[PDB]
Design an enzyme around this catalytic site. Structure first.
Site, mmCIF file in Angstrom:
data_model
loop_
_atom_site.group_PDB
_atom_site.id
_atom_site.type_symbol
_atom_site.label_atom_id
_atom_site.label_comp_id
_atom_site.label_asym_id
_atom_site.label_seq_id
_atom_site.Cartn_x
_atom_site.Cartn_y
_atom_site.Cartn_z
ATOM 1 N N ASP A 213 3.424 3.568 3.066
ATOM 2 C CA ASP A 213 2.480 3.176 2.023
ATOM 3 C C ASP A 213 1.363 2.400 2.714
ATOM 4 O O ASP A 213 1.571 1.264 3.155
ATOM 5 C CB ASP A 213 3.196 2.329 0.972
ATOM 6 C CG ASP A 213 2.310 1.934 -0.208
ATOM 7 O OD1 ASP A 213 1.066 1.961 -0.111
ATOM 8 O OD2 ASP A 213 2.893 1.553 -1.244
ATOM 9 N N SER B 122 2.070 -1.160 -8.250
ATOM 10 C CA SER B 122 1.094 -1.969 -7.522
ATOM 11 C C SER B 122 0.536 -3.127 -8.351
ATOM 12 O O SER B 122 1.272 -4.073 -8.649
ATOM 13 C CB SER B 122 -0.032 -1.080 -7.007
ATOM 14 O OG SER B 122 -0.557 -1.594 -5.795
ATOM 15 N N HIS C 188 1.314 5.813 -1.416
ATOM 16 C CA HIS C 188 1.091 4.675 -2.296
ATOM 17 C C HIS C 188 1.461 4.957 -3.746
ATOM 18 O O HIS C 188 1.727 4.013 -4.499
ATOM 19 C CB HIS C 188 -0.379 4.249 -2.230
ATOM 20 C CG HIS C 188 -0.665 2.977 -2.959
ATOM 21 N ND1 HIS C 188 0.019 1.807 -2.704
ATOM 22 C CD2 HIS C 188 -1.518 2.702 -3.972
ATOM 23 C CE1 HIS C 188 -0.422 0.859 -3.512
ATOM 24 N NE2 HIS C 188 -1.352 1.377 -4.292
#
Lengths: 270, 266
Positions: free
Chosen positions: B215, B93, B244
């Site tokens: 996600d 991320s 996620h």
């Protein structure tokens, strides 16, 4: 409320993976890098929790609470708090020296958390009495303390090779010297004095979890007879293995011999 | 001291070095299922971004970390201090966006980037889908500000997704609850308004874009957008793992995919 700083202040690290968890506790003046020859052989099958005891050079000295750590149970409280915070329901505890005694105390307060203890270079008491041989007369401890306060760096640079044993300029002697020197001198002195006055002997019968007592064939801080003393005094199951390796920190200085011993006692139950 | 400040740890051996960057609010224990599969072959460097619960909040420099630009400085400084020339960089991320920002200054340092749950912009514009309308990011900001711990206790299982009441959900909740609330608010707002798009074209290092299904923070279309926009080589693999943080919650799926992309370049 829910925010815990114990993982930051104690440099807690969880590595590996597996059903069971191993917790590694460091001896006086060392940080968790002392376990770096063991951890590679654990991570394939075990979760491993590493941490630094408060006052190590890797920790912030502003957080060393002198009243908390004046006697050793303060470090046992830290260990239980780490186990609470990281949701360690049950563990195999490996502790070097000081940390062996800390895990013993913690296991008395909370035996449910400990499947077994594995000790390296553990002593319940340094100074001799009329009926107990710890390897030091009190006058020796006093002179050692006097050398440490009078010239802290010189005392450390000189004692570190003797404590590690078997050859100065070994890499292990250099690392140990560096960790000792990185301690704040007033914390190093205070913790030394705590260890000089520590006496586990009355409490040893309260230990009920199984203990694997490992120690070197030659340890300037721990006569081999002390390992046998522990075996006779512990309240639960125990076994003693004297390793062929020498030194106070054999997990650091003799990993080729010590790591295989450690692994054997991790897998097998008494 | 940046090593100690960021809890940098180096393990393994080999010609390649792999560097793992963690996502928001997360420390390097999220990689604990991956690293034992790497150290027989590679050197592996782990670190924590400032603001993580494992770091000292006193060293969170709000002006330094006001933009995602500030975390790449940390990465490069760490890469320099530990003498890492050329790495394989795996970022989750926000760390995917950081390694990408960092690759733009310094292509020479990255053999390739591997991204998990990477996104260049969270909020939708007229020609772009990010997964969130600006009002949604606004509500989430206000929720964090109005009751930090309640927000986290609710969002953490949502964000982890996949299987419910898992070990992964407990660890993620625990690491988010260990951030200092003002840091969490600060960093979240940056991530909410970040926009990497005008820089993607200068990302010329090849990028493996791994995306979980379902996600909540990255729709599957975002992986394809990144594939279209990067300046160099790229490939997308949509994984069967959900959520996620699939490296944390679904390692049995995600680690083999990771190992494949670490070893196979294209």
């Amino acid at each position: 409320g829910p925010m815990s700083t114990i993982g930051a202040t104690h440099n807690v690290r969880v590595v590996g993976s597996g059903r069971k968890t191993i917790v590694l506790g460091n001896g006086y003046g060392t940080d968790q890098s002392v376990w770096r020859h063991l951890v590679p052989h654990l991570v394939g099958r075990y979760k491993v929790l590493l941490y630094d005891n408060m006052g190590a050079g890797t920790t912030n000295p502003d957080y060393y609470d002198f009243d908390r750590y004046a006697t050793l149970e303060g470090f046992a409280y830290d260990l239980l708090a780490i186990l609470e915070e990281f949701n360690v329901r049950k563990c195999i505890y490996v502790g070097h020296s000081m940390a062996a005694m800390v895990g013993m105390i913690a296991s008395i307060f909370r035996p449910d958390l400990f499947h077994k203890l594995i000790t390296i270079s553990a002593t319940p008491r340094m100074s001799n009495t009329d009926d107990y041989y710890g390897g030091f007369e009190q006058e020796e401890l006093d002179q050692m303390d006097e050398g440490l306060r009078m010239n802290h760096e010189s005392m450390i640079r000189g004692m570190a090779p003797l404590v590690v044993g078997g050859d100065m300029d070994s890499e292990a002697v250099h690392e140990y010297t560096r960790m000792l020197l990185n301690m704040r001198p007033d914390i190093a002195l205070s913790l030394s004095r705590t260890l000089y006055a520590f006496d586990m002997r009355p409490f040893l019968g309260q230990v009920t979890v199984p203990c694997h007592i490992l120690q070197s064939s030659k340890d300037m801080g721990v006569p081999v007879a002390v390992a046998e003393y522990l075996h006779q005094s512990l309240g639960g199951k125990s076994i003693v293995e004297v390793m062929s390796a020498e030194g106070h920190l054999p997990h650091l200085s003799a990993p080729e011999i010590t790591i295989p011993v450690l692994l054997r006692h991790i897998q097998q139950d008494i």
